[PDB]
């Protein structure tokens, strides 16, 4: 199908504890392949893929570089934010960063992210067209000026469109049996009486690859989001993920109620009844 | 700028008494990243428990998901407890083979 | 491929 590659960073400072912590981690769709912690010993990026294993030590080396540089920048970064704002060096503050582009089911360019965050809110953001800017606030209008000044976009379309697409294209091939699967939810249907005039009825879906999912209830086939609980998607730590969805239900009529799965692991999609 | 974390505690696998499986704790949506998270065993918190890379979502919300091997009984309890800025007192949350 | 990034 469709697919994504993405960086993650985050650095939070820490006065009076020293540099601010630096961390960043990579995804090819849900799958996370590499990480950088500046507070671990390795001081280099770490694989977390076994198919990203097979490069040679000049992709680490060149990746590492990168990665090291960036939290110095970040570090830096966090230094001027405090400037921009006039906030006190004795708060702390995070900085996050996300990279990456979407190719379709022929590994074409889609499109090209570049975005940033101060303290859980937009900061500044490539554009959809990659070239030019969203800036937040005033603060990120000075990030603006400076970047289009020194025509960082020029850079950032390229990369996006070209190398972060051939890396996408090249680590999709090489974890291939695993990128490329999906695998689709085992599903079932609980009961769990709550009084003595009313039911609930969860209806699961486990083991599906990719995080992306829906599952709705159904009353006489009328949609109901009301009185459903619904739980996020959560990983179950070996490549798979989990949800359910819940309905109460007057005792005696859960013959009523249907659960609807969808999913691409699913050639059509799926009507479960109790 | 301050989330509060929605928390989940379940098995990797379903349930099965004397199999060994992987107890989870999934923390998401929270900001920001500190955050405080034991798995217990009656009462008792155990000791090696690991946690994935610090990730967030689309929103710049952050997701940690702790986890350990572990052997469920009938008897027994497991939970997670949780703390963050945004909780007044660190949060406890029971396993529930059903949930 | 990690990005490059720059000065805020």
């Given at each position: 199908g469709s697919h994504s590659m993405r960086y993650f960073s985050t650095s939070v400072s820490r006065p009076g504890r020293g540099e601010p912590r630096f961390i960043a981690v990579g995804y090819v769709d849900d799958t996370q392949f590499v990480r950088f912690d500046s507070?671990?010993?390795?001081?280099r990026m770490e694989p977390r893929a076994p198919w990203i294993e097979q490069e040679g030590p000049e992709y680490w080396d060149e990746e590492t570089g990168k990665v090291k540089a960036h939290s110095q920048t970040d570090r830096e970064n966090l230094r001027i934010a405090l400037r921009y704002y006039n906030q006190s060096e004795a708060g702390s503050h995070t900085l996050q960063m996300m990279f990456g582009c979407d190719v379709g089911s022929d590994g074409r360019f889609l499109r090209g992210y570049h975005q940033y965050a101060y303290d859980g809110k937009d900061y500044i953001a490539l554009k959809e067209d990659l070239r030019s800017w969203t800036a937040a606030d005033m603060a990120a209008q000075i990030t603006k000026r400076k970047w289009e000044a020194a025509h960082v976009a020029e850079q950032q379309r390229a990369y996006l469109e070209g190398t972060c697409v051939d890396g996408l294209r090249r680590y999709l091939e090489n974890g291939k049996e695993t990128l490329q699967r999906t695998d689709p939810p085992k599903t079932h249907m609980t009961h769990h009486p709550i009084s003595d005039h009313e039911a609930t009825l969860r209806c699961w879906a486990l083991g599906?690859?990719?995080?992306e999912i829906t599952l709705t209830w159904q009353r006489d086939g009328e949609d109901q989001t009301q009185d459903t609980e619904l739980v996020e998607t959560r990983p179950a730590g070996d490549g798979t993920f989990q949800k359910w969805a819940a309905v109460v239900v007057p005792?005696?009529?859960?013959?009523?109620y249907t659960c609807h799965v969808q999913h691409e692991g699913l050639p059509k999609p799926l009507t479960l009844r109790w | 700028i301050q989330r509060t974390p929605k928390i989940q505690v379940y098995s990797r696998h379903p349930a099965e008494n004397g199999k060994s499986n992987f107890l989870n704790c999934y923390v998401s949506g929270?900001?920001?990243?500190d955050i405080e998270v034991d798995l217990l065993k009656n009462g008792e918190r155990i000791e090696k428990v690991e946690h994935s890379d610090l990730s967030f979502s689309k929103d710049w919300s952050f997701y940690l998901l702790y986890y350990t091997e572990f052997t469920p009984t009938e008897k027994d309890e497991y939970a997670c407890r949780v703390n963050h800025v945004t909780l007044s007192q660190p949060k406890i949350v029971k396993w529930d083979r059903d949930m | 491929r990690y990005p490059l990034t720059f000065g805020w």
């Open positions: 507070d671990a010993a390795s001081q599906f690859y990719p995080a005792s005696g009529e859960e013959q009523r | 929270f900001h920001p990243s | -």
